[PDB]
Design an enzyme around this catalytic site. Structure first.
Site, short mmCIF file in Angstrom:
data_model
loop_
_atom_site.label_atom_id
_atom_site.label_comp_id
_atom_site.label_asym_id
_atom_site.label_seq_id
_atom_site.Cartn_x
_atom_site.Cartn_y
_atom_site.Cartn_z
N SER A 25 0.85 -1.18 0.00
CA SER A 25 0.00 0.00 0.00
C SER A 25 0.89 1.23 0.00
CB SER A 25 -0.94 0.03 1.21
OG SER A 25 -0.21 0.20 2.40
N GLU B 149 2.65 -9.96 -22.77
CA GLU B 149 1.66 -9.40 -23.69
C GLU B 149 0.79 -8.35 -23.01
OE1 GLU B 149 1.89 -13.29 -26.32
OE2 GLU B 149 0.02 -13.05 -25.19
#
Ligand SMILES: Nc1nc2c(ncn2[C@@H]2O[C@H](COP(=O)(O)OP(=O)(O)OP(=O)(O)O)[C@@H](O)[C@H]2O)c(=O)[nH]1
Ligand SMILES: Nc1nc2c(ncn2[C@@H]2O[C@H](COP(=O)(O)OP(=O)(O)OP(=O)(O)O)[C@@H](O)[C@H]2O)c(=O)[nH]1
Ligand SMILES: Nc1nc2c(ncn2[C@@H]2O[C@H](COP(=O)(O)OP(=O)(O)O)[C@@H](O)[C@H]2O)c(=O)[nH]1
Ligand SMILES: Nc1nc2c(ncn2[C@@H]2O[C@H](COP(=O)(O)OP(=O)(O)O)[C@@H](O)[C@H]2O)c(=O)[nH]1
Ligand SMILES: [Mg+2]
Ligand SMILES: [Mg+2]
Lengths: 91, 440, 71, 427, 440, 436
Positions: free
Chosen positions: E140, E254
């Site tokens: 975080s 990809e």
């Protein structure tokens, strides 16, 4: 509190104990003085001064009102719960 | 037929050998009393016990060891222990009073009264021997009876038995802590005695075992018993190729011809790679490639040193269990390509490999785990000059003020051998560094 | 259960005996006699909290020292 | 199989030695009538180091009880374990000691040296391979400083190759028993520096102080002080008596603590000391015992170690114990205190570990330390000596037996070299 | 063979992975004790666990995860929880003191005391790896070790592993709901390292998962556990084609070549459309068109920024379940006919499509439902610039009075690093502006 | 590893601390003897934050107890949970103070100091990794900081290197009934700021009002007043001891509440306080906790929060909960009254969720706040030095000892500037142009 102004019920007592380091003893018997006060239903215990072996001595439990064993702990200790040759639990 | 004599001199050596000989008995089928149970399946050959044990008719097997000390208080626990009937009663010889951290006492004062009875017993063992390879002594490196009696033992056994592959196991006082203050005096004094008579003197530290057990075994506050147990496995691995057949059998003479490039550099470092706990061996996969790589990590060395500083010279690797040779060849090749591991420029070969078919035996109550694979690597590297220089300075810082000298010169020993051992230590360091720089 | 012949030290009433071997004159002659020598699965070893009686003992793993402390 | 013959002299040394034979007996399980009743064969394994066999399954201690007056021999014999001593070993004179050095070394000591040497050499030939001696005495009285020094002189003249040991009660600054206290001490340590090769320096106010604010006893008698000095008396020799993972006999401590042929005065100590109220609140392990080594709280000599530097220290441990937990922590207390340990010495510490702990204690240890703080003690009593000697205060008692003026100042020239040698190698 | 190591850093990162590895073990047949059950099989083997699990000789599956964190008693929840024997005890590593919501403490003071051990475990986990696709981190932007120790981890992993597909998952400080006061400081400092050492940084907000839990899942008072299961559902869909075959198998490489157009723009928007409770899931049909529509809805985003204030660049749709390619093309076509959904004119194609045949797996005690088909959306808009301009307003509001700066300067950093961290943030808004205006 | 050592000074540290230790012993499950009789394992997992294992299954606290009167801590050692403390920690003097502050700094300069430092040393070092210390005391008596700046000036030499909390009982604004009193208020300050900077100022007058108006206890002693602080002490350490969904130790609270290094002001508060007859009729929800902990009534410091601005708010909660209700507490009260939440800090609230609740209660919280209305707390002390300082009439008792009276006059100069520094960040706004 005027008919029982300075009237105290006094008992002898001792506690059994288990010692971790058995350098001088195997089991300990520490003497005590159970004081019950009629004017306020109040319990005080004391440890008398002994010979050249000293603990921290003196007052063991202050003059306050110890309730009961954990079953039905709402009530408090009265004059009827104190007797000689009996078992009483103070904390 | 492929036999060795293992005389364990010193209070440390007899306790290294206590856990070393319990591993040897449980590796074969021999019980703690020496009996050899019938109709019980074990994994040796048929002459596999013959390296470390003799054969009697009644099934009793006796170890080929002589426990030597000058304190009667450490063999008496062996002489009353579980291994009473294992050892022949005349093997466990004892002294009369302690050597007391004194090289000048175990070499000149008490040793002369008992070295006559030591070598006579080694004659009694070697006469029964028929194909002997070498001598496996166990001793400490900075004591009185592990450093004073050891020098009388090796010098006399070298001249009596001539050229024989007498390898050595020692417990080295390298790191910041030690158990004695006069111990650095004993360290360099026995180094002269082990410089020309030893053939492969393997050094083992104490804090190095402390760190690898605290980390890899996940085990805190060690005693000496599990330190004994790990040394027992790292010697059993060395002599496993004599005791069992394998894909690549490596006899004890094969160690000599390529772990020692020059006759003064015969101090290889040892390492045992699968030092793994009983819980982690159920968790990690154990394969050849990742424990051969984990064997070269500096946090797993058996000596508290930094192998990233010095460059390696020779490494032999011994494999036990389900090991196939291509997996080692992949494991060696992926290590030669690592740039953090540096070799001397002269030798491109670098490695020797031996594969044994016997997985190691785990003892009950131990800390190791039942692994199907083990790696024991013996490295000759340039790094141990660090461990030696901060012991030479550790000696010199004492010798300048002549502290603890009158205890040594007061009996047998003269003062002049202190400076001779110091300059030979400097000559040992200098010759160990002149094989470090790159040739042109 | 005899004393091995190499054993020096002390055995009672050896000085008043004679004519027998060291393993027979000792074997012929205290209750606590040790000289002759006659949950862990519910916690992982990375644990760093507290368990009582778990900061004391060796000869067995950390994952085994919480075995002997509990059991 | 190695053994130590015991000797004791003086009034206090007799009672300190007698309390030492209390401690050895119940640790080896042998009753007031000398019959074994404990339960361990470890107890009789090395019983020959201190005791002798007697007919009927009977064990007699090997000790020689020595004084000048017959008022202490009967007191020791009337004690709880006074019976186990051999009455032929009760060698003593007739007249009083007189609290004088020249009475116990020159005039009335000369009729007992023919008796004490024969009874010692009787006990030094019945044994197998002699190792050393033990003597309990003080430097404050007459017979403990005079015959307790003459005994040291005659034995070394006969047994030079055996490592002698003597455990002495050196005088106290404020708690004073006799007014000739620095006379008897400086004369006695004049020889004790030459012919002992190992001795331990024990005060009496430090015994008072550790019994008052460490052990927390209100009115300490003599007997608990005797028990406390007997606790560190037996812990030096425990490596001879029970096995271990590395042992250390008296010769091992002598070679590997004493750096120079003259500095062999040591600080004793004992680790698990605790009051009866604080026994449940102590986690009895070596992380609190190792700190109990090097702190001045447990110093049995009243010269604080923080005004000096530790030359060498031995810590002899007793109990089922870890090894790095001693080994790493004794390094850490040297690393955390670098100025309290001398240079030209890399490691200042010996570790020795014994298998068998004392009775009722899971874990104990005894402290043995060499400090340069000993020079505080010897210079102070040198100052106390020259305060009275320049006045020629009490020499009229000492000069009557044949001691001239120069025999005193020769002792001080041979004593001020101790504080000179300690200061020379302190910095 | 294809695989990726997952890194979980911080209390946020550890708690994400616990509800994430709960999904992974249940997605396969892996039980909490590691071993797959002999009775009952979850499906075909296919060695599909290899992307996240390692197989040992005893038949145990081990996650390729490191739980590195400075907070001791959130990892000890795992160390005594149900997933006890799944993880190694040395894979889960803890510090001694927290960074205490300080980027400087997690980067400089405490972080250097543990950075050596975690890189050793990352190296050892990746040593047995063969075809490692990359890493996944979970943290975080508001914690100390979630921002400071994370930043140091990318600094070291960039030079140890070079150019490798290092994915990033993070939790943004919301515009309004925020559990810390120093949270704008930590977020602006860790993005200074994320912008140059993270190949793709997935962007997740707490308020938006709070919003979709109360609205779509119809649960009142959601907790951190529900946000944890929603995130782990998406991360499973990100790595979905790595394990199960599909019509259009799309790799992690990809993803990067089809989502991020320029080396600063690697901040995709996360969206999981078929998030629906069980009492209202089986009632209506869930066509692939309406869940493609729900991906573009403003309130279904997991970051509090609607794309109406921005322009889409590249959208990566990851469909799972009974999904044919042809009706995805119809769903993509009907999105393109809307002028409200703004697409940049330099991406006429716009969409990257991945189809997988394995539907999402439901956890017992969870709040989602078993859907036949599902979709994960990875958008890329200029609308993310307003989520960062608010953070600069939050940063500049309290940095200008030097609030909480001595809690950073004293712990090993200079005051100029704050202006340097706002500096790259002052350029990032203009970098999102220059790829937004139309070319003329 | 993370650990706290409790220093108790005065009657006040000893009586408050003794109530604190019995609370923690109930929370962790320790009997008055010292053994564990708990009904869970998480009551034992992190008990190496306040208790040490002694051999025999006897857990012993880590409090050193300090007082200059022997009599006070004999009642502590003979109380209900009183024998748990190890005797060596009980370090006593023989004579304390009385009447005159000038006596207090020209009385026992250095006698008891080094004895305590030995006890504080051994107890800290024989451990793993020190989270810090905590200190319970009051600002009053016959010495003030007279013993204080005497004894602690020897201990402050290196102590501000790690965390050190202080739950200090600040003087109450009622009457002056200590005769020559307004000389101990001026000489109190000196280093009142730059050695703790995490002080939880706790007034006794506010302690009674929560007992009178909120708890509705008819006869509140000093004991149940010490029960309210003990909950707060447990509250700010419960994330370190018990696990939670959003952990927050002392440093994480200290980092996230202290923008500037001179802010030893954290007014405490415990959210679920209800009367006995009204506990049955209580919802006990997340909004219900929040409307009480932010209320001016439930503030254990005599400073109404609506007299200043909350510079930063902490919300260490306990239970299975929410935190978004606290967001409405700003958005309603802040954006409408911008003078109740400081605007140059964007979000003023730190939250924490510790799963294990207090005993009996299902849900709780522990508010500490750095509001700038604490300018008034060191202003009532400010009109209570000036009022009697100038006469120096009964100060002839002081005069006999009478140290340097520049030290008299420099202490309030290191207090009114602290008030000014709070007056600044109450009036300072974001766009620094509109206040000149
Ligand atoms: N692993 C292991 N090492 C031991 C053991 N006993 C002693 N040592 C080692 O021996 C060292 C001290 O022993 P030394 O002083 O060298 O004893 P020694 O070589 O037998 O010579 P002496 O001192 O006369 O007994 C320690 O540092 C230990 O490392 C043991 O039981 N196991
Ligand atoms: N979605 C989600 N976010 C969480 C969860 N737990 C913590 N967070 C986020 O973490 C932030 C709190 O700071 P953390 O990053 O957890 O601090 P930390 O990881 O403990 O690091 P340190 O402060 O150094 O101890 C909150 O703002 C949350 O957004 C969780 O379970 N789910
Ligand atoms: N431990 C111990 N010390 C003693 C005892 N009795 C005396 N001492 C010490 O010995 C000193 C007195 O002995 P001393 O006068 O030298 O005896 P003397 O040599 O026979 O005259 C005193 O200062 C005591 O501190 C005892 O019973 N036990
Ligand atoms: N809460 C609480 N306050 C106390 C107690 N004892 C004293 N005080 C407060 O402290 C002030 C005086 O205490 P003080 O003299 O400083 O005690 P000392 O620190 O031992 O000197 C009084 O105004 C009381 O309000 C107590 O037991 N509990
Ligand atoms: Mg030995
Ligand atoms: Mg945290």
């Amino acid at each position: 509190w005027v008919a029982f102004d300075k009237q105290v019920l006094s008992f002898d007592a001792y506690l059994e104990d288990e010692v971790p380091d058995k350098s001088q003893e195997n089991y300990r018997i520490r003497r005590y003085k159970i004081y019950f006060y009629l004017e306020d239903d109040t319990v005080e215990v004391n440890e008398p001064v002994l010979q050249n072996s000293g603990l921290p001595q003196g007052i063991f439990i202050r003059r306050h009102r110890i309730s009961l064993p954990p079953p039905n702990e709402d009530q408090f200790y009265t004059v009827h719960h104190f007797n000689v040759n009996t078992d009483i639990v103070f904390y | 037929m492929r036999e060795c004599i293992s005389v364990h001199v010193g209070q440390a050596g007899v306790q290294i050998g206590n856990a070393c000989w319990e591993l040897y008995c449980l590796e074969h089928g021999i019980q703690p009393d020496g009996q050899m149970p019938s109709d019980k399946t074990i994994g040796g050959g048929d002459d596999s016990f013959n390296t470390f044990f003799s054969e009697t008719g009644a099934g009793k097997h006796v170890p080929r060891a002589v426990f030597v000390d000058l304190e009667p208080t450490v063999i008496d626990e062996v002489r009353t222990g579980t291994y009473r009937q294992l050892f022949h009663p005349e093997q466990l010889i004892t002294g009369k009073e302690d050597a007391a951290n004194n090289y000048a006492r175990g070499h000149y004062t008490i040793g002369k009264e008992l070295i006559d009875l030591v070598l006579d017993r080694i004659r009694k063992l070697a006469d029964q021997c028929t194909g002997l390879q070498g001598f496996l002594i166990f001793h400490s490196f900075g004591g009185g009876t592990g450093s004073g009696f050891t020098s009388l033992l090796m010098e006399r056994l070298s001249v009596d038995y001539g050229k024989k592959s007498k390898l050595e196991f020692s417990i080295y006082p390298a790191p910041q802590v030690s158990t004695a203050v006069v111990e650095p005096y004993n360290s360099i004094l026995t180094t002269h005695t082990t410089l020309e008579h030893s053939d492969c003197a393997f050094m083992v530290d104490n804090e190095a075992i402390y760190d690898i057990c605290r980390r890899n075994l996940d085990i805190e506050r060690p005693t000496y018993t599990n330190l004994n147990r790990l040394i027992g496995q790292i010697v059993s691995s060395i002599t496993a190729s004599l005791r069992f057949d394998g894909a690549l059998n490596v006899d004890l003479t094969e160690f000599q011809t390529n772990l020692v490039p020059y006759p003064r550099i015969h101090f290889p470092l040892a390492t045992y790679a699968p030092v793994i706990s009983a819980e982690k061996a159920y968790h990690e996969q154990l394969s050849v490639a990742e424990i051969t790589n984990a064997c070269f990590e500096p946090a797993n060395q058996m000596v508290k040193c930094d192998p990233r500083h010095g460059k390696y010279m020779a490494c032999c690797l011994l494999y036990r269990g389900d090991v196939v040779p291509k997996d080692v060849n992949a494991a060696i090749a992926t290590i030669k390509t690592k740039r953090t591991i540096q070799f001397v420029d002269w030798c491109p070969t670098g490695f020797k490999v031996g594969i044994n078919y016997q997985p190691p035996t785990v003892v009950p109550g131990g800390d190791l785990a039942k692994v199907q694979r083990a790696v024991c690597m013996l490295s000759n590297t340039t790094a141990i000059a660090e461990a030696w220089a901060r012991l030479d300075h550790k000696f010199d810082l004492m010798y300048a003020k002549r502290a603890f000298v009158h205890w040594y010169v007061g009996e047998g020993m003269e003062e002049g051998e202190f400076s001779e051992a110091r300059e030979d230590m400097a000559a040992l360091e200098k010759d160990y560094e002149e094989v470090g720089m790159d040739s042109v | 259960p005899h004393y091995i012949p190499g054993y020096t030290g002390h055995c009672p009433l050896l000085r008043f005996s004679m004519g027998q071997t060291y393993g027979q004159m000792t074997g012929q002659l205290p209750p606590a006699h040790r000289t002759l020598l006659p949950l862990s699965s519910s916690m992982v070893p990375g644990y760093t909290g507290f368990v009582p009686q778990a900061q004391f003992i060796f000869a067995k793993n950390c994952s085994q020292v919480w075995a002997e402390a509990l059991n | 199989m190695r053994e130590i013959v015991h000797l004791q002299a003086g009034q206090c040394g007799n009672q300190i030695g007698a309390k030492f034979w209390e401690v050895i007996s119940d640790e080896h399980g042998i009753d007031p009538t000398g019959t074994y009743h404990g339960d361990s064969d470890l107890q009789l394994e090395r019983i020959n180091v201190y005791y002798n066999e007697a007919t009927g399954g009977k064990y007699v201690p090997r000790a020689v009880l020595v004084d000048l007056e017959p008022g202490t021999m009967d007191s020791v014999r009337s004690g709880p374990f006074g019976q186990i001593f051999r009455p032929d070993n009760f060698v003593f004179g007739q007249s009083g000691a007189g609290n004088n050095w020249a009475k116990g070394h020159y005039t009335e000591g000369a009729e007992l040296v023919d008796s004490v040497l024969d009874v010692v050499r009787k006990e030094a030939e019945s044994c197998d391979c002699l190792q050393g001696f033990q003597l309990t005495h003080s430097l404050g009285g007459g017979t403990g400083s005079g015959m307790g020094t003459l005994l040291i002189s005659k034995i070394r003249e006969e047994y030079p190759d055996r490592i002698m040991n003597t455990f002495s009660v050196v005088p106290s600054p404020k708690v004073s028993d006799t007014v000739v206290e620095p006379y008897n001490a400086t004369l006695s340590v004049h020889q004790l520096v030459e012919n002992t090769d190992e001795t331990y320096c024990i005060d009496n106010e430090a015994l008072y102080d550790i019994c008052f604010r460490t052990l927390k006893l209100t009115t300490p008698t003599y007997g608990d002080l005797n028990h406390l000095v007997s606790a560190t008396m037996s812990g030096v020799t425990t490596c001879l008596r029970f096995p271990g993972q590395l042992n250390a006999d008296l010769r091992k401590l002598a070679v590997n603590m004493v750096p120079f042929p003259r500095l062999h005065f040591f600080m004793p100590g004992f680790a698990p000391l605790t009051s009866r109220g604080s026994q449940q609140y102590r986690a009895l392990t070596v992380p609190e015992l190792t700190q109990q080594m090097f702190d001045a709280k447990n110093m049995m000599a009243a010269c604080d170690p923080r005004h000096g530097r530790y030359l060498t220290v031995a810590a002899v441990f007793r109990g089922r114990m870890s090894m790095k937990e001693v080994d790493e922590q004794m390094l850490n207390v040297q690393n955390k205190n670098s100025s309290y340990f001398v240079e030209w010495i890399p490691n200042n510490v010996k570790t020795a570990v014994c298998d068998i702990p004392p009775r009722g204690l899971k874990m104990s240890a005894t402290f043995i330390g060499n400090s340069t703080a000993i020079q505080e003690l010897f210079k102070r009593i040198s100052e106390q000596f020259t305060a009275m000697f320049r006045r020629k205060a009490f020499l009229h008692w000492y000069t009557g037996e044949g001691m001239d003026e120069m025999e005193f100042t020769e002792a001080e020239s041979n004593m001020n070299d101790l504080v000179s040698e300690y200061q020379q190698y302190q910095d």
